[PDB]
């Protein structure tokens, strides 16, 4: 009935994604309807050239990355495409094929930018939101994909030098990987992998003692607590754990954070012999 006439607008916009002369308006409208149309992701994936057009919107801003010149209009446009790609990454009917096409690999350059402008920050957050949507599914293939595409080094750079929100999202991604059994075994497999992660977490504890952040501190502690489940990682943490986690440095900030206090207390008990 009345809702069927709206679906024809959805179909026309998806078809208008192909031609560059009608893509920008179709990107705008479809990103708005991505919450009300549950089956939008399979329609986006299985239509002709739709995903290819979204990859085109991504690659077309690569020249704007270096030198950093990304404008507000460019960042808005490409983030409408990333929004629709996030829709595809979330849907269980298209998530596997999304990963099989290695689509996140073309968002990795965005996570490598260091420009502090809002167009670049809005780009990194949107890109991080795509990866966040992936790990929120708690799927084994999402972990195996991220472990093999070298996204952990990208998160550690963001966790060390990004904005306060960027650090928290990147730490959350690393946390979700660590929570999965395969991710913990992968990072603790060699000392080269583990030591590089523990050093970044250590530097973040020093940064948090100067510039405090409640949510960032919570997920930095969750990462440490998860690492302590592994025997090889537990031995190294006994000599490299920041003293600021064992004394009362974060006593006043954690006063009303019940769960982080519980995690931090479980962490110190795990390291006790």
């Amino acid at each position: 009935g009345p809702h069927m006439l709206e679906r024809e607008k959805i179909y026309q916009w998806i078809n208008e994604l192909s031609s560059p002369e009608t893509r920008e308006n179709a990107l705008l409208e479809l990103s708005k309807k991505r919450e009300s149309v549950p089956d939008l992701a399979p329609m986006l994936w299985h239509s002709f050239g739709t995903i290819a057009a979204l990859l085109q919107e991504i690659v077309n801003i690569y020249p704007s990355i270096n030198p950093p010149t990304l404008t507000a209009h460019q960042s808005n446009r490409v983030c409408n495409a990333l929004a629709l790609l996030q829709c595809v990454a979330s849907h269980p009917e298209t998530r596997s094929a999304f990963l099989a096409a290695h689509i996140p690999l073309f968002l990795y350059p965005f996570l490598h930018t260091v420009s502090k402008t809002r167009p670049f920050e809005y780009l990194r957050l949107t890109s991080l939101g795509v990866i966040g949507a992936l790990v929120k599914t708690d799927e084994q293939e999402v972990i195996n994909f991220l472990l093999t595409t070298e996204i952990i080094p990208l998160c550690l750079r963001i966790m060390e030098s990004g904005s306060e929100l960027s650090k928290t999202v990147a730490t959350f991604i690393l946390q979700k990987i660590l929570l999965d059994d395969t991710g913990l075994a992968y990072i603790c497999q060699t000392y080269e992998r583990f030591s590089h992660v523990a050093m970044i977490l250590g530097k973040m504890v020093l940064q948090l003692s100067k510039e405090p952040s409640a949510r960032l501190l919570k997920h930095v502690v969750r990462c440490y607590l998860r690492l302590s489940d592994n025997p090889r990682a537990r031995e190294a943490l006994r000599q490299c754990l920041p003293d600021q986690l064992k004394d009362t440095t974060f006593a006043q900030v954690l006063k009303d954070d019940t769960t982080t206090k519980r995690w931090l207390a479980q962490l110190v008990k795990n390291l006790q012999e």
Partner: peptide, 22 residues
């Protein structure tokens, strides 16, 4: 122009705040 970027930026901050916790 610059208003929509700021509007979209605040919405992403709201979105990522829920995602990281919930």
């Amino acid at each position: 122009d610059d208003q929509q970027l700021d509007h979209n930026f605040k919405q992403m901050e709201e979105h990522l705040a829920l995602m990281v916790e919930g």
